[PDB]
């Protein structure tokens, strides 16, 4: 609402308040094609996210805890003495591609590639999944999973040549025996606009994710609440 240096106020000023969201993922996970849809909103002054989302062709060929990190940083909380570190809503409203490389421990591996960036009023995440080298009896096409997710830190540092940001980072999903399956995931953001943006000193977000399911749904989907918050620097 009030910062000293204009390029924080412009992106501010996108997400002062409730912002709706759409999220669209077109997968292809050995061969299983499948479609996500999700809508919801996002409020990045508490970091709090809340989305609905459904797979519309039919039922979800892998477990949906293994797609959260999949399915917009832009919505994360950064304190007042830190908004010169947030790199996502500065590439705003023309937006960011957010690209990953996910690997299962024993099994196989997502590739994503995101465009996230404003739609009029509307924020859109819009991804393409390809995923290969799955186990038929492993935890993610065998949905052993639990129907759940752990809170997570991950670090966030500068790509100076890119005008970007890269991460690297471990997701823990627990597995319905009381084992974990892990998630090694590597990240890189790119600004889709040619304008400068705001490329930050190394800090952490701190995340927490609640799952749950809506008892009036029929179709197979989930309900997603997200809690992002900036920390590390002093």
Known sequence: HHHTDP???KGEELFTGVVPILVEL????????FSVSG???????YGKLTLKFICTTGKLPVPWPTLVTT???????????????????????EGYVQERTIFFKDDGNYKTRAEVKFEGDTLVN??????????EDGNILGHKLEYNYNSHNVYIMADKQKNGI?????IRHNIEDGSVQLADHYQQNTPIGDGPVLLPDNH????????SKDPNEKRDHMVLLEFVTAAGIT
């Open 7 to 9: 390029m924080v106020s």
């Open 26 to 33: 077109d997968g292809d996970v050995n061969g299983h094609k």
């Open 39 to 45: 809508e919801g909103e996002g409020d990045a002054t």
């Open 71 to 93: 399915l917009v940083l832009c919505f994360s909380r950064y304190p007042d003495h830190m908004k010169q570190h947030d790199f996502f809503k500065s590439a705003m409203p």
């Open 126 to 135: 819009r991804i393409e999944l390809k995923g290969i080298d799955f186990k």
């Open 166 to 170: 890269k991460s690297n980072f471990k």
């Open 204 to 211: 952490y977000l701190s995340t927490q994710s609640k799952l």
